[PDB]
Design a protein around this ligand. Structure first.
Ligand SMILES: Nc1ncnc2c1ncn2[C@@H]1O[C@H](COP(=O)(O)OP(=O)(O)NP(=O)(O)O)[C@@H](O)[C@H]1O
Ligand SMILES: [Mg+2]
Length: 1123
């Protein structure tokens, strides 16, 4: 819509509210009320149209029903609210209401209120302001969000807010800095929930049963509806409370307001306000997004990204003030994001005095609900696709049930018309028959199953942010995995330093130098690079924190770490002091990390005094071989041999900028990234044996043997990824790597299929399609370079269908892989840890962030699913719960509808003969069905996954066929019992006990019990009926009650429900009929479950016969070893 210029807003219309007397649910019904009044009190129209006082009551009920329906249509439909309440008056200068309809599956539509001079409104707790130059409502624009990018001179010399009237203008404009989610009480939430259409339908059914003189049954179902809606309201309140726990509590911060330092809570924070950041306390990150002006902040973005590696946010005072701000470039580490824990504040411009507490100066950019964590919280709460939104499949199923209802009700209306019954009683019977089929809990059953799955998943420390991806986990075809941090533990051990003799020794046939010296016996330059090229920082308490790889190589180095970013070695191969002056941070797209430092290092055995400035860079060996001077002979073969064993290899390089002396202050030290990560020498290879997680192999073999495909997406080498995937059993056949034959600047021009042992070499033109022999008989590994060369070609859709290891991929390449896998129709799971997967975690159908730590807030916004533990077994469990979710939904979609259908036709078999159900009988039947529902609701899951897959859709052949077959069996037994009862006694108004009423009541009781016992899903996805002995005994108790009052063994139970005594031959025939009905229902359900319930695995997840034979042999061996 041009009125609101946002991508998530579909329609916007500037309404104007009308008075209450002009409302469309008031004025025409007030107009037509005296017509009915003149019909009623004035005679000669009493017999003209209505004819009776019961018809008068029917017309009064119909008019009141139409009035309350026209009132409720303004509440359960936004467009009908705009039609019936407010006139259009499409002009900006007089509008007061804005109808906002968002795009599909992006929250609930609303009629927002215009508040104003700045014209604004609030939709989904997002503030929209009217711009007259654009002539449209739009999202709030900050100083950062300006289209001309501001210079740093307005940020270094910001000096805080300097005007009181401008402070009040900022307060009225951007609002206060709070996570404004209002949790509702029980009263207003139940008031909103009592206006929902299925509550209205249930209350209308209660009134219909009350009109037919059913006191106890209507009271029971009203009490049950009240407590069920109370349960739903408490569930929604609990969910909103756990969402409210994600908010940062206010804590006193020192801001610079009116030229003075002032302590104030974090609820009052406006953009452009100068603030001082210190060490944050527990259960609090920082409030809102800031940019560092003066100081260095060691922060931890465990909220925005899954990993807990602390980054080193620098300042902007070293950058010139005339430079254009680059949020995605040099000043990426300049900003500080909200919700993130700052681990340290160190000082290593505007003339302002320093803060009383030793903190860094920052400027607020994005405050309130529009900060990045807050903008994710707004999407996760108000702008998400809700589980409780009524699907069209459930409504079409309800319409199918209503089609069956009308099929029964038309026949009972024709039979009552032909037999000349009372038309009001016949109409009430037909409306009762129609209304006894729609199950009011049916559209909300998926939400209940999702909530039960969330409560089950919270046991394994798995917290789900967006609960509409729980059914998606029931239909996952591809289960993508990261390698490092997901299938690999964080306790890395340094194997050592390799390739010291490159260009200067055991050599293989391909020339690979296998001499791996230890870190202590390494050279001086290798030791200085390992002491220089890291992002390690010592906290004020005295704990070294950083990358686990950098911590591992620090512990292998034997060098202590000082206070002012210095590292010393006391009298281990060399002795001296290094001090890092500038530090270029590591990026996943660059695959390197460099640092400029000052060295004073002496070798203990020869001397060789190395002083002065130094550049140490470590990274991926292909990038380093691209950016050094002279590539040594057999460079590629060394790292390919040390990667063929599965170890992770980095390259270390050094460059002396000034040699003897010093570089000179920080004026020269402000160099460029591309001007210092070039013309390098070679220092060595850092080889680390990254250890596999203990649960990785078991979880991946559980996923592969359960109709899921496991692929590996990782930024590491092809050989490490291939060796891990062979250990974890992702790749079974011979593998082929699609990569450049040489990773130099000239050799990166063609693509080659290569073997791991470097024996097969096949040239590939990327425009030509892939050879089908390679796709069919070989597993494939694809490098991100070869993926980038396959961006817009025909073979790419082949590659994503036949590759299970992706290596050397950028985060954008992981996003491209997951988008392409989404585009082919495969549902995707992505399990990731680092900041290289946050694009991938938000593009998969379900994304899990594996927080590597072993023993509501502190839940990351990087992924919709967050596993607090480090185990890989949290990945199948989610999928298991997802499958169970669908399975639970399926069983309720097979029970409730069938239950209602039975009840409807039972009423029909009564209402064909003029007899009605007893009040006590139908109340006892409803109580027993509620008892069986409570008995069947409590069921856990099995300890493993299965090859069968549940059907996601509800209109499949299995569910519809089973329901139709069981309904046909039930209606055949009901018709036969009715004909037998008419045969025994002829048919010739209060409730009087009869043989037909007792037989129909006993049949509907035993048929509801039979469809509870038959349609319960069992062994392939959950426990069986016999295993939950509480559930089995609860079903068997009602079974024994029904069969005891059917055998006439207890006359007290038969006289309690007003059941006539039965003839012995009739009793035997009816017991045989009940057994035949239960047996036929179980046979039909078992046949249709064995035939059509198993949703077939897709072609990417189908396994070859040798894999199935190996799986069967291993399962037989484990079953033998169990004995
Ligand atoms: N601290 C580091 N310093 C230098 N280079 C690094 C560092 N960490 C990773 N790299 C390199 O960056 C490359 C790709 O970046 P990245 O994807 O972040 O590593 P990764 O964690 O192994 N990928 P992944 O397995 O998906 O988590 C790796 O193959 C390493 O060579
Ligand atoms: Mg990772």
């Amino acid at each position: 819509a041009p009125l609101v210029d946002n991508p998530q807003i579909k329609s916007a219309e500037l309404l104007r509210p009308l008075p209450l007397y002009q409302h469309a649910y008031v004025w025409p019904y007030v107009i037509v009320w005296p017509v009915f009044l003149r019909v009623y009190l004035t005679q000669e129209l009493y017999d003209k149209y209505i004819g009776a006082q019961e018809w008068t009551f029917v017309w009064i009920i119909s008019i009141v029903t139409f009035q309350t329906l026209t009132w409720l249509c303004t509440h359960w439909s936004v467009n009908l609210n705009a039609l019936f309440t407010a006139k259009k008056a499409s002009s900006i200068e007089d509008a007061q209401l804005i109808k906002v309809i968002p795009v599909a599956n992006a929250g609930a539509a609303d009629i927002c209120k215009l508040v104003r001079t700045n014209i604004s409104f609030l939709f989904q707790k997002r503030r929209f302001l009217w711009y007259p130059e654009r002539k449209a409502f739009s999202t709030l624009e900050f100083d950062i969000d300006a289209e001309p990018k501001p210079t740093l001179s307005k940020f270094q010399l910001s000096r805080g807010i300097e005007s009181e009237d401008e402070l009040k203008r900022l307060e009225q404009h951007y609002g206060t800095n709070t996570f404004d989610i209002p949790v509702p009480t029980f009263t207003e939430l139940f008031k909103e929930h009592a206006v929902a259409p299925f509550f209205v339908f249930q209350v209308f059914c209660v009134g219909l049963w009350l009109l037919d003189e059913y006191w106890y049954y209507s009271l029971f179902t009203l009490v049950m509806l009240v407590v069920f809606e109370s349960t739903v309201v408490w569930q929604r309140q609990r969910t909103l409370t756990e969402f409210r726990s994600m908010s940062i509590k206010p804590y006193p911060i020192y801001v610079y307001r009116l030229g003075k330092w002032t302590e104030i809570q974090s609820d009052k924070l406006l953009p452009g306000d100068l603030v001082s950041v210190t060490r944050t306390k527990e259960d609090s990150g920082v409030a809102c997004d800031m940019i560092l002006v003066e100081g260095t902040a060691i922060v931890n973005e465990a909220m925005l990204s899954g990993e807990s590696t602390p980054l080193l946010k620098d300042s902007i005072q070293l950058r010139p003030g005339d430079a254009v701000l680059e949020v995605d470039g040099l000043d990426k580490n300049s900003l500080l994001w909200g919700g993130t824990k700052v681990l340290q504040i160190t000082h290593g411009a505007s003339g302002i005095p320093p803060p009383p507490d030793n903190g860094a100066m920052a400027v607020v950019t994005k405050t309130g609900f529009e900060t990045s964590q807050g903008s994710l919280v707004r999407t996760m709460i108000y702008s998400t696709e809700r589980v409780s939104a009524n699907n069209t499949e459930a409504l079409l199923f309800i319409l199918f049930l209503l089609v069956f209802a009308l099929a029964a009700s038309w026949y009972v209306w024709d039979e009552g018309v032909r037999k000349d019954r009372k038309r009001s009683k016949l109409l009430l019977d037909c409306i009762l028959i129609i209304t006894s089929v729609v199950p009011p809990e049916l559209p909300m059953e998926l939400s209940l199953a999702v909530n039960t799955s969330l409560s089950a998943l919270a046991k394994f420390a798995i917290f789900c942010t967006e609960p509409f991806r729980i059914p998606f986990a029931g239909r996952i075809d591809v289960a993508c995995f990261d390698k490092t941090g997901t299938l690999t533990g964080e306790d890395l051990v340094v194997e050592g330093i390799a390739g010291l003799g490159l260009g200067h020794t055991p050599k293989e046939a391909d020339g690979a130098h296998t001499r791996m010296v230890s870190v202590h016996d390494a050279g001086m330059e290798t030791t200085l690079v390992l002491a220089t090229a890291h992002a390690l920082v010592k906290l004020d308490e005295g704990e070294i924190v950083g990358d686990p790889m950098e911590k591992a190589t620090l512990n292998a180095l034997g060098w202590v770490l000082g206070k002012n970013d210095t590292l010393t070695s006391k009298p281990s191969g060399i002795l001296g002091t290094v001090q890092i002056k500038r530090r270029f941070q590591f990026s996943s797209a660059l695959k390197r990390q460099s640092s400029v430092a000052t060295i004073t290092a002496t070798e203990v055995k020869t001397g060789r005094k190395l002083r002065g400035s130094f550049v140490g860079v470590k990274g991926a060996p292909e990038t380093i071989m691209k950016m050094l001077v002279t590539v040594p002979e057999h460079y590629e073969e060394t790292y390919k041999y040390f990667t063929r064993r599965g170890s992770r290899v980095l390259a270390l390089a050094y460059k002396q900028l000034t040699t003897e002396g010093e570089l000179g202050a920080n004026k020269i030290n402000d160099l460029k990234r591309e001007s210092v990560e070039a013309d390098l020498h070679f220092a060595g290879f850092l080889v680390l044996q990254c250890p596999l997680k203990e649960d990785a192999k078991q979880a991946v073999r559980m996923l592969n043997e359960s109709s899921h495909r496991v692929v590996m997406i990782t930024g590491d080498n092809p050989l490490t990824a291939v060796h891990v995937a062979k250990e974890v059993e992702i790749v079974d056949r011979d593998v082929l790597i699609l990569d450049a034959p040489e990773h130099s600047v000239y050799g990166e021009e063609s693509l080659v299929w290569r073997s791991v042992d470097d024996k097969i070499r096949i040239d590939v033109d990327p425009t030509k399609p892939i050879d089908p022999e390679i796709l069919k008989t070989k597993d494939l590994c694809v490098t991100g370079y070869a993926l980038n060369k396959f961006k817009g070609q025909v073979g790419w859709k082949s590659l994503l269908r036949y590759t299970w290891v992706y290596a050397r991929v950028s985060p954008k390449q992981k996003e491209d892989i997951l988008l392409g896998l989404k585009d082919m129709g495969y549902y995707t799971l992505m399990a990731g840890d680092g900041t290289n997967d946050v694009g991938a975690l938000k593009q998969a159908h379900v994304g899990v962030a594996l927080l590597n730590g072993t023993q509501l807030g502190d839940a990351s916004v990087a992924a919709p699913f967050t596993s607090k533990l480090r185990n890989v077994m949290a990945i199948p469990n989610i999928l298991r719960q997802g499958r169970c979710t669908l399975v639970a939904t399926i069983q309720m979609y097979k029970i409730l509808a069938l239950n209602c259908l039975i009840s409807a036709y039972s009423l029909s078999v009564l209402y064909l003969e003029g007899i009605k159900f007893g009040d006590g009988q139908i109340t006892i039947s409803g109580m027993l069905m509620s008892v069986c529902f409570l008995s069947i609701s409590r069921a856990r899951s099995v300890e493993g996954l299965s090859k069968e897959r549940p059907q996601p859709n509800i209109f499949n052949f299995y569910i519809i066929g089973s329901i139709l077959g069981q309904f046909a069996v039930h209606v055949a037994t009901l018709i036969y019992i009715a004909q037998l009862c008419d045969q025994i006694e002829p048919r010739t108004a209060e409730f009087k006990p009869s043989l037909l009423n007792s037989a129909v009541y006993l049949l509907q009781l035993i048929q509801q019990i039979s469809t509870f016992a038959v349609n319960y899903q069992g062994r392939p996805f959950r426990e069986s009926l016999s295993e939950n002995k509480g559930m089995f005994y609860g079903i068997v108790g009602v079974t024994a009650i029904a069969f005891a009052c059917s055998t006439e063994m207890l006359p007290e139970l038969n006289e309690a429900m007003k059941l006539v005594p039965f003839n012995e031959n009739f009793k035997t025939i009816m017991t045989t009929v009940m057994i035949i009905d239960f047996v036929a229902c179980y046979v039909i359900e078992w046949v249709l479950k064995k035939l059509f319930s198993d949703l077939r695995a897709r072609d990417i997840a189908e396994r070859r016969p040798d894999q199935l034979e190996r799986e069967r042999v291993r399962k037989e061996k484990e079953a033998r070893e169990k004995e």
